[PDB]
Structure formats: C-alpha cells, structure tokens
C-alpha cells in the first residue's frame, strides 16, 4: 500500500526538523524512530549501505527508506523485559538494567541510559517495574 497524504505530511514534519533539506545518516536513525519506528543500529547500517557511496538521505529517499523498513509490538518488548525479571515477579533492578545496556549488547551511552532512566528516576526504588517503561516506550 502507498503512504497516504496524512502520512507523507507527518513524515515531512519529522524530516524538516532535522536548513539542509536532506538529513545525515546519523540523524536518519533518530528520524525513523521519531515516526514510531524502533529499529536497532544493526538494521540501520544495512539500510544505509544500500543507498550511500552521496553521504546523506533526502525526503524522497527517506520515504523509500520508510517504505523499506516497516513494522508488522508491546508483547515483544514485554517478553524482552521478561528476560530481565529474573524472579519473573514483573520487576527489574534499575541498577541491573543500567549495567546490561551500557556494557552488554548495544552499548548505550551514559547520556542515553540517563535519559531512559531520567523519567525512570521518579520510579527509582533501587529496583523498578518495567510496566511504566513499556507504557512510556510505546507512547508516541
């Protein structure tokens, strides 16, 4: 199916916030997610190698990138978080999560986890429930 005028308009709004008239590859990640997407940086490098030699992406190219990548949910991140509730109690240590993200898997910066944990700070009891996160992460 083809992107409706409503979608193309929403996409132009995102793209325009990032006066070049084309967005960088580094910003490309942030622009796709800002439009509801949640890809990993692995998935990104494949798509950026597909259309660069240039160095950037403009809105038409970006729309084809938004056509290339498409999400077919909340259960996938719940189950991914379930791997963190070692007790299966439905809760996860904030400190433990911080150690996981920064040093294991996709290395998040101290900035990035701080922003994730910034709102989490209201939650922080040393340990934190992930249901506040699943709701915050899903919301646009």
């Amino acid at each position: 199916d083809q992107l409706t005028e409503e979608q193309i308009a929403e996409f132009k709004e995102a793209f325009s916030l990032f006066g070049d008239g084309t967005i960088t590859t580094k910003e490309l990640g942030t622009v796709m997610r800002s439009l509801g997407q949640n890809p990993t940086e692995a998935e990104l490098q494949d798509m950026i190698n597909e259309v660069d030699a240039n160095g950037t992406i403009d809105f038409p190219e970006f729309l084809t990138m938004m056509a290339r990548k498409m999400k077919d949910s909340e259960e996938e991140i719940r189950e991914a978080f379930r791997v963190f509730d070692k007790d299966g109690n439905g809760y996860i240590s904030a400190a433990e999560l911080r150690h996981v993200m920064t040093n294991l898997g996709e290395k998040l910066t101290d900035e990035e986890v701080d922003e994730m944990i910034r709102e989490a700070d209201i939650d922080g009891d040393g340990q934190v429930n992930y249901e506040e996160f699943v709701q915050m992460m899903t919301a646009k």
Binding site: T30, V31, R33, F84, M101, M136
Partner: protein, 90 residues
C-alpha cells in the same frame, strides 16, 4: 538460554532509542510552536509599526495640504483688501 537473552538486550536497546527520540521530537515540536507564536507576535508588531508610521505620514501631509489651501485663501483676502482700496480711489 544465552542467545535469546542477547536478543533481549538488543530489543530493549532498540525500543529505548525510539522512546528517547519521540521525547526529543516532542521537545523539538513544542520548541518550534513556541518560537512560532512568539514570532507571530514579532511580526504582528512589525506590521503595527508600519501602521503607526502611515498615520504619522497622514498627519504630516494633512497639515501640509491644509496649509497649502490656506495659502490660496490668504491671497484672496489680501487681494480683496487692495481692490477695496482701489474702490476707495473712485
């Protein structure tokens, strides 16, 4: 059990970056709307200043044109003064 845990750390990491971006988006979007309405003030008061200048130009021309018309009517009165003097001759 080990590979699904790595699928889990990357999954949470990817969903993490999405929320951060949408937060940032909300911040950028609100920042733009903020600067815009303020700029809407900044331009409306620019149009008002032009209006005040137009009124001042209208006031300046009013006295100029009004005084120019009085030049003719003062001529008329002085001319009548001499004609009455010439009528006083005969």
């Amino acid at each position: 059990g080990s590979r699904h845990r790595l699928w889990a750390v990357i999954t949470v990491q990817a969903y993490a970056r999405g929320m951060i971006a949408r937060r940032l988006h909300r911040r950028l979007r609100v920042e733009y709307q903020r600067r815009l309405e303020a700029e809407r003030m900044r331009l409306a008061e620019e149009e008002k200043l032009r209006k005040e200048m137009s009124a001042k130009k209208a006031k300046e021309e009013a006295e100029r044109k009004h005084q120019e018309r009085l030049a003719q009517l003062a001529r008329e009165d002085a001319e009548r003064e001499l004609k009455e003097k010439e009528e006083a001759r005969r």
